[PDB]
mmCIF file of C-alpha atoms and ligand atoms in Angstrom:
data_model
loop_
_atom_site.group_PDB
_atom_site.id
_atom_site.type_symbol
_atom_site.label_atom_id
_atom_site.label_comp_id
_atom_site.label_asym_id
_atom_site.label_seq_id
_atom_site.Cartn_x
_atom_site.Cartn_y
_atom_site.Cartn_z
ATOM 1 C CA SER A 1 0.124 0.203 -0.004
ATOM 2 C CA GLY A 2 0.811 3.589 -0.343
ATOM 3 C CA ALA A 3 -0.032 6.992 -1.536
ATOM 4 C CA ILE A 4 1.626 10.390 -2.793
ATOM 5 C CA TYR A 5 0.074 13.329 -1.344
ATOM 6 C CA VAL A 6 0.640 16.457 -3.365
ATOM 7 C CA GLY A 7 -1.407 20.018 -3.256
ATOM 8 C CA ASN A 8 -4.822 18.746 -2.890
ATOM 9 C CA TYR A 9 -4.522 15.489 -4.530
ATOM 10 C CA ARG A 10 -3.980 12.083 -3.441
ATOM 11 C CA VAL A 11 -2.201 9.669 -5.886
ATOM 12 C CA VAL A 12 -2.588 5.764 -5.360
ATOM 13 C CA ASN A 13 -2.896 2.423 -7.252
ATOM 14 C CA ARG A 14 -5.979 2.435 -9.282
ATOM 15 C CA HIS A 15 -6.346 -1.305 -8.157
ATOM 16 C CA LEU A 16 -5.995 -0.025 -4.206
ATOM 17 C CA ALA A 17 -8.445 2.714 -4.761
ATOM 18 C CA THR A 18 -11.063 3.248 -2.164
ATOM 19 C CA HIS A 19 -14.850 4.345 -2.523
ATOM 20 C CA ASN A 20 -13.855 7.890 -0.922
ATOM 21 C CA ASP A 21 -10.975 7.796 -3.847
ATOM 22 C CA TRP A 22 -13.791 7.008 -6.340
ATOM 23 C CA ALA A 23 -16.119 9.390 -4.455
ATOM 24 C CA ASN A 24 -13.705 12.380 -4.940
ATOM 25 C CA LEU A 25 -12.268 11.263 -8.306
ATOM 26 C CA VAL A 26 -10.244 13.438 -10.312
ATOM 27 C CA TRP A 27 -8.422 11.310 -12.752
ATOM 28 C CA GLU A 28 -7.987 7.707 -13.267
ATOM 29 C CA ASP A 29 -6.157 5.415 -15.969
ATOM 30 C CA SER A 30 -6.368 1.526 -15.727
ATOM 31 C CA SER A 31 -3.687 1.125 -18.392
ATOM 32 C CA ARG A 32 -1.016 3.126 -16.056
ATOM 33 C CA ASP A 33 -2.731 1.431 -12.753
ATOM 34 C CA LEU A 34 -3.244 5.039 -11.502
ATOM 35 C CA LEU A 35 -5.876 6.857 -10.012
ATOM 36 C CA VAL A 36 -5.791 10.662 -8.307
ATOM 37 C CA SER A 37 -8.766 11.933 -5.808
ATOM 38 C CA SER A 38 -9.266 15.346 -4.434
ATOM 39 C CA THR A 39 -8.030 15.763 -0.545
ATOM 40 C CA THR A 40 -9.456 18.635 1.975
ATOM 41 C CA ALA A 41 -5.885 18.779 3.624
ATOM 42 C CA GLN A 42 -3.005 20.099 1.549
ATOM 43 C CA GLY A 43 -0.222 17.288 0.993
ATOM 44 C CA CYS A 44 3.603 17.902 1.072
ATOM 45 C CA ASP A 45 5.224 15.435 -1.363
ATOM 46 C CA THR A 46 6.837 16.977 -4.326
ATOM 47 C CA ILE A 47 6.714 15.284 -7.606
ATOM 48 C CA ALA A 48 9.921 14.858 -9.530
ATOM 49 C CA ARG A 49 10.054 17.187 -12.741
ATOM 50 C CA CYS A 50 12.959 15.229 -14.445
ATOM 51 C CA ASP A 51 14.491 12.348 -16.698
ATOM 52 C CA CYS A 52 16.469 10.671 -13.799
ATOM 53 C CA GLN A 53 16.775 6.773 -14.352
ATOM 54 C CA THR A 54 18.289 6.514 -10.847
ATOM 55 C CA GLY A 55 16.495 6.736 -7.460
ATOM 56 C CA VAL A 56 15.675 4.998 -4.097
ATOM 57 C CA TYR A 57 12.384 3.079 -3.656
ATOM 58 C CA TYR A 58 10.659 1.637 -0.661
ATOM 59 C CA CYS A 59 10.046 -2.120 -0.458
ATOM 60 C CA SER A 60 7.335 -2.694 2.378
ATOM 61 C CA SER A 61 7.961 -6.681 2.031
ATOM 62 C CA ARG A 62 11.574 -6.139 3.097
ATOM 63 C CA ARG A 63 11.431 -2.859 5.140
ATOM 64 C CA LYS A 64 14.183 -1.448 2.998
ATOM 65 C CA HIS A 65 14.925 1.437 0.672
ATOM 66 C CA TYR A 66 16.818 0.319 -2.275
ATOM 67 C CA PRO A 67 18.773 2.190 -4.521
ATOM 68 C CA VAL A 68 17.941 1.295 -8.257
ATOM 69 C CA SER A 69 18.348 2.470 -11.783
ATOM 70 C CA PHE A 70 14.983 2.463 -13.580
ATOM 71 C CA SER A 71 13.900 2.529 -17.273
ATOM 72 C CA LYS A 72 12.410 5.240 -19.013
ATOM 73 C CA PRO A 73 8.350 5.300 -18.865
ATOM 74 C CA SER A 74 7.153 2.913 -21.782
ATOM 75 C CA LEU A 75 4.569 0.491 -22.746
ATOM 76 C CA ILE A 76 5.724 -2.825 -20.930
ATOM 77 C CA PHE A 77 4.198 -6.225 -20.997
ATOM 78 C CA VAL A 78 3.424 -7.295 -17.464
ATOM 79 C CA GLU A 79 2.544 -11.023 -16.396
ATOM 80 C CA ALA A 80 -0.479 -11.851 -14.649
ATOM 81 C CA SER A 81 -0.567 -10.778 -10.776
ATOM 82 C CA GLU A 82 -3.043 -11.337 -8.295
ATOM 83 C CA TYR A 83 -4.882 -7.975 -9.318
ATOM 84 C CA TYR A 84 -4.353 -7.610 -13.123
ATOM 85 C CA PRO A 85 -4.222 -10.433 -15.931
ATOM 86 C CA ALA A 86 -0.992 -10.334 -18.152
ATOM 87 C CA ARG A 87 -1.413 -7.156 -20.172
ATOM 88 C CA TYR A 88 0.363 -4.019 -21.566
ATOM 89 C CA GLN A 89 0.840 -1.465 -18.978
ATOM 90 C CA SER A 90 1.623 2.109 -19.962
ATOM 91 C CA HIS A 91 4.238 4.651 -18.470
ATOM 92 C CA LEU A 92 6.112 1.830 -16.461
ATOM 93 C CA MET A 93 9.687 1.801 -15.721
ATOM 94 C CA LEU A 94 11.309 -1.277 -14.507
ATOM 95 C CA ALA A 95 14.249 -1.844 -12.261
ATOM 96 C CA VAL A 96 15.945 -5.112 -11.034
ATOM 97 C CA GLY A 97 14.693 -5.657 -7.521
ATOM 98 C CA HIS A 98 12.297 -7.354 -5.267
ATOM 99 C CA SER A 99 8.181 -6.355 -5.564
ATOM 100 C CA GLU A 100 5.190 -8.434 -3.958
ATOM 101 C CA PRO A 101 1.739 -7.561 -4.389
ATOM 102 C CA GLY A 102 1.625 -5.841 -0.682
ATOM 103 C CA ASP A 103 4.830 -3.557 -2.024
ATOM 104 C CA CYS A 104 2.346 -1.650 -4.263
ATOM 105 C CA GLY A 105 2.381 2.110 -3.538
ATOM 106 C CA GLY A 106 5.741 2.246 -2.192
ATOM 107 C CA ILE A 107 7.758 5.510 -3.315
ATOM 108 C CA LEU A 108 10.377 5.758 -5.816
ATOM 109 C CA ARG A 109 12.389 9.028 -5.139
ATOM 110 C CA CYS A 110 15.213 10.878 -6.869
ATOM 111 C CA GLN A 111 16.987 14.231 -6.157
ATOM 112 C CA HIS A 112 13.927 16.046 -7.564
ATOM 113 C CA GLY A 113 11.066 14.520 -5.694
ATOM 114 C CA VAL A 114 8.814 11.515 -6.287
ATOM 115 C CA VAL A 115 9.269 10.013 -9.466
ATOM 116 C CA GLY A 116 6.253 7.308 -9.193
ATOM 117 C CA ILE A 117 4.716 4.364 -7.159
ATOM 118 C CA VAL A 118 5.471 0.566 -7.168
ATOM 119 C CA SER A 119 2.830 -1.066 -9.671
ATOM 120 C CA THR A 120 4.391 -4.125 -10.664
ATOM 121 C CA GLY A 121 6.538 -7.103 -9.432
ATOM 122 C CA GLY A 122 7.703 -10.718 -10.670
ATOM 123 C CA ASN A 123 10.789 -12.288 -12.191
ATOM 124 C CA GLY A 124 12.905 -10.353 -10.220
ATOM 125 C CA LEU A 125 11.939 -6.985 -11.571
ATOM 126 C CA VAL A 126 10.101 -4.149 -10.215
ATOM 127 C CA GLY A 127 7.913 -1.935 -12.139
ATOM 128 C CA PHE A 128 6.909 1.999 -11.365
ATOM 129 C CA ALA A 129 3.902 4.013 -12.568
ATOM 130 C CA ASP A 130 5.458 7.269 -13.570
ATOM 131 C CA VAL A 131 3.827 10.497 -12.208
ATOM 132 C CA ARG A 132 6.367 12.827 -13.548
ATOM 133 C CA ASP A 133 4.430 13.708 -16.804
ATOM 134 C CA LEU A 134 1.406 14.506 -14.876
ATOM 135 C CA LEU A 135 2.215 18.152 -14.750
ATOM 136 C CA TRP A 136 -0.954 19.265 -13.435
ATOM 137 C CA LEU A 137 -0.536 17.578 -10.207
ATOM 138 C CA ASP A 138 1.545 20.853 -9.154
ATOM 139 C CA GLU A 139 -1.507 23.232 -9.605
ATOM 140 C CA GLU A 140 -5.170 24.156 -9.174
HETATM 141 ZN ZN1 ZN B 1 14.944 13.401 -10.752
#
């Protein structure tokens, strides 16, 4: 589990969204596994605005932050997981690393802020849903 809290936005994995998320929807995209809902309280996370390919992600199933290199956001074929069939997922970045279903929502961060959240795992790869292209999270 995990979310990003920026401005009056809450960013979560679409497969972990709550009724309150859907009842306060801003934007959602199944192909990216992302959903954004509106918040009453201001959040303090900064979204990275950059093309970094190195950062650190949180792996809840190891209670550890791991430094990783990660790929550019792309359309990646993902094997079946407990929450999606095998499919193409968009805006996805991969690294070599550990990722269980419970690790979804862990933050990937670089020197510029939050890059994305854990979304996929298996075959010794961890996939992160990028948020750096969602420039509107920074305003309004
Ligand atoms: Zn960066």
